[PDB]
Design a protein around this nucleic acid. Sequence first.
DNA 1: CTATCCCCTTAAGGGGATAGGGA
DNA 2: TCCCTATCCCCTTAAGGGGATAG
Lengths: 71, 71, 414, 414
Amino acid sequence: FQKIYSPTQLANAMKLVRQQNGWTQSELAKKIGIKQATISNFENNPDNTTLTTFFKILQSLELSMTLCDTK
Amino acid sequence: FQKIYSPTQLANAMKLVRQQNGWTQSELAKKIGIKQATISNFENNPDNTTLTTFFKILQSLELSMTLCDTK
Amino acid sequence: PKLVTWMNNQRVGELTKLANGAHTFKYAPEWLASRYARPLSLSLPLQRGNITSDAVFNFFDNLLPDSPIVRDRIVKRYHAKSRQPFDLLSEIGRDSVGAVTLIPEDETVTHPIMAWEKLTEARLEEVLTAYKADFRISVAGAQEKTALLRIGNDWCIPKGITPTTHIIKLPILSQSVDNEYYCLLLAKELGLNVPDAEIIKAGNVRALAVERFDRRWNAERTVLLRLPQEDMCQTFGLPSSVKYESDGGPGIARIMAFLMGSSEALKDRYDFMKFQVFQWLIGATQGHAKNFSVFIQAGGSYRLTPFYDIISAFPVLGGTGIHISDLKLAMGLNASKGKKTAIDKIYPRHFLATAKVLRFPEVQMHEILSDFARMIPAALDNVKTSLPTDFPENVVTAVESNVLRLHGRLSREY
Amino acid sequence: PKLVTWMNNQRVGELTKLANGAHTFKYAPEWLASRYARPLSLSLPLQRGNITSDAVFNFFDNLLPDSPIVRDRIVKRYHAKSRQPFDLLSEIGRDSVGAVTLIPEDETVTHPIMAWEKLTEARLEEVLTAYKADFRISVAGAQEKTALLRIGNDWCIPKGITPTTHIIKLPILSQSVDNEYYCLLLAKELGLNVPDAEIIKAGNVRALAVERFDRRWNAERTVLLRLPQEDMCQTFGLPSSVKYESDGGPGIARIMAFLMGSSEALKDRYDFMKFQVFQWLIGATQGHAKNFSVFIQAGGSYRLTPFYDIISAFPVLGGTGIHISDLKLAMGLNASKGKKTAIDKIYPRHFLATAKVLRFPEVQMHEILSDFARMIPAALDNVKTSLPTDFPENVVTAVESNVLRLHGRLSREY
DNA sequence: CTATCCCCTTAAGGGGATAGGGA
DNA sequence: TCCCTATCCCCTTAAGGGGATAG
């Protein structure tokens, strides 16, 4: 897939995946266990965002991550 | 590659890459702009770890990440 | 001598017992790079050096039986050099729980990869009754239990590094074998993921035969594979001396957070809570850390493994001293005053109190309680109507009775 | 009418100018799914709906020249409906900076994918001299400049959506074409990543010809491709009116944090700081947000582009009013008392002060200054010995003089 | 449907002390 | 008897979630 190198191109990519799936910030927030506010913070200000948060939301998107070389 | 689903299985995998590359917590900490202590915390306590931190370390390992479906 | 650790005929690494009595492990470089690469145990994350922490000892320890008597039982049989974990594993190393195959360094001695002796009805009656008063196996758990391989229509004994397909349990509780065989049929009927168990009858003896979920025939049907796994004490690298929360073991919060890292996190998280209700319904109090396992998957991934080792603490009331008010869950729920655990004092508000702190989807706690409310009755019927003609109607009666008693507490709200 | 945004013959989306005068952009679903899928600008992250933020206006705005008298020159030439970004871009939309090709939504048009008119020495002398007193192009920057296509041995003019290979600069500073042809030759000699520029001479006019790094021939040499890019105003979705830090524009910190997100983060970061010293040494004060660019790579990746638009503020001292003590860097460095920015007041200690807060590897800051310390002299030679026989020896002299003057500050330490 | 907003109580990365870790 | 790294001290700052609601 496409290599991500920052919190912002990250949040962007995931927010994309949410929209292209018809999910709202609310339903994902319920499934996992965080408030709708957090998802919104993550999407617009991912810099100061926790790792558990990020994985929580990763899970709610039926997604996963993997490392690789930057070439 | 291998799908990661938590902060812990993440730090483990990255720590591995570091060892199998002969890098120390200090040298990576210098290149990026972070404390050696932070690299330590991330490696042992990745739950409460910032996303910029994680990407900073991601870069210093000449790595990158990607989203994918959990199948 | 070091124990070479194998996993389905793959060289993982080596257990080494130092002169100081020091247990240590080092992954084999060829394993760190393998396709199948994964840590033996989550408490032992892949890395390069010699691992020296307590997790190494505790992990391997949690492969042998709980009771140190069972242990002497083993230092006798296969003449062990000690009751030490290393020394015992150097005897019954082959078919251990999970997937690990510990074979001494001085011992390629490769095991017939696929070999078995088709047992007779008397040989069986002998092996079954035996565990009361080539078979290099190891079963970890609360009670006395062996394991066998079912092929075709005969119960055979594995020979070599030949895996087993059934965990067979002997009657200890007066009818443990019957209690659990009920609990399982029930848990399946209610959608919970448990293994198909059958009852085997050998002359006089009566044993339970549980299908292993940590075993699977390869595609060709030519090789029996062991699936790597570990329980909640191994995962947190704790000694089996703390499997119960009341002793320092992991509880709901602990397990739940962890599950968040599963491959099937949201599903696992649900099932787990759900199982916290089930155990309450059938008054099961054996819900300790060593009774929950995760499968270990390529890369270090894990998902919750089916539920197992289910027994109801109901057929043990009244005529003895035990009473319903003395039944306490292994893992506590969030209460008004601290944490409540007494089955007969537990109510739906408690499960919802718990979900509340754990931040488990309140709506999903509502759906779980609700699903049980309207299924229990139908379940009990279908299970009862399955119980073989020779099934102790008191076990049925005792369980089926109190379940409704508790179930009432549900229907009255859902 | 909407403008359909093209990128190397791939439909990215559409620019819409609403009644109320509200600019809006919506990515084509097909592009949101494409192999080549990437935002038009990092200030405009791929998503589904209509993008309405000021980032949409400012981005497209930043494709046109800054002096909006030059905008009237365009509203005059290609009769524009306004000096509005949308109305102008609907005329010269074809060859814009970066890789965007704005063609009216009406505007499909199969415009010659690859067509060009081999100019004469006199047509060239016409075009060059022209910008002082099919050519649908757009150059963004501080001074008056057009662009051409060099093929074979001739300077040709593009026809249709045909791309250009060189950004040509006309004499505004009396010899801006000579000043920058030096600094470029210098910057290459010192290893800084810059584009190869040449000087073209047409009769009387003298013009600069910079090879474009946002343009590249396909493998087949059958199509010239536009490499998507954008400057530091667009990246942060700022208006060109704030390109300078002293007006609100991004500075070192801002740029350095951003670069952390680069494909080549550590390398860029270095290259960047390094340039900040280079700029100091050759007294360049044109180091504004619009002079640094990132390439945009499939998926949203970006990496620093070579440096460009380099001029030295030295050949403008003394005889006029300007003095060395009046030269200030576009981007300030960290000082004892706030932030110093006066070139002749700047010292290595200021670069190491900066590197200190930004948490840029102190050692690497040491290596940069070092490397300059023992390179400058040799560089000046190799460059000076390249200046064509007709090069204004005051430009050389002036720059080469002050560079050493400042260079001393370095060699006395390193 | 997001996004701040008042309030929080377990505390990021990090300032650069700092002391066993292991080979 | 030594590099490496799991910790460990004190101040600026404060994840975010916790929950009311504001474009």
